[PDB]
């Protein structure tokens, strides 16, 4: 759970070049932050891991 949370976070950041919304910037592999958040373990497991 912890490894997966860190990995998702690391990869989310790879995608979010904090750059300026350009409404037009082509993401790597066409992936958005939301596509990665879906690969997170179930919310009950994430809270358990953080506690």
């Amino acid at each position: 759970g912890l490894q997966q949370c860190m990995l998702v976070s690391e990869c989310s950041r790879l995608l979010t070049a904090d750059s300026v919304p350009p409404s037009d910037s082509t993401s790597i592999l066409g992936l958005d932050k939301q596509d990665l958040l879906d690969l997170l373990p179930p919310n009950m497991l994430v809270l358990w891991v953080r506690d």
Partner: protein, 50 residues
């Protein structure tokens, strides 16, 4: 029949365009692996110049 075929062509075209855009992005030289560090100090490397 004409409207239906027209929709399929549009979907394929949009997908094709988006793919070309992504390929262009991935081919950027700055993203491509560890080119052997440059022998010359880049003008943007202020610390090495200093």
């Amino acid at each position: 029949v004409y409207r239906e075929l027209g929709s399929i062509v549009q979907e394929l075209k949009e997908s094709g365009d988006k793919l070309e855009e992504r390929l262009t992005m991935l081919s950027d030289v700055n993203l491509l692996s560890a080119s052997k560090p440059r022998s010359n100090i880049d003008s943007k490397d202020l610390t090495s110049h200093r």
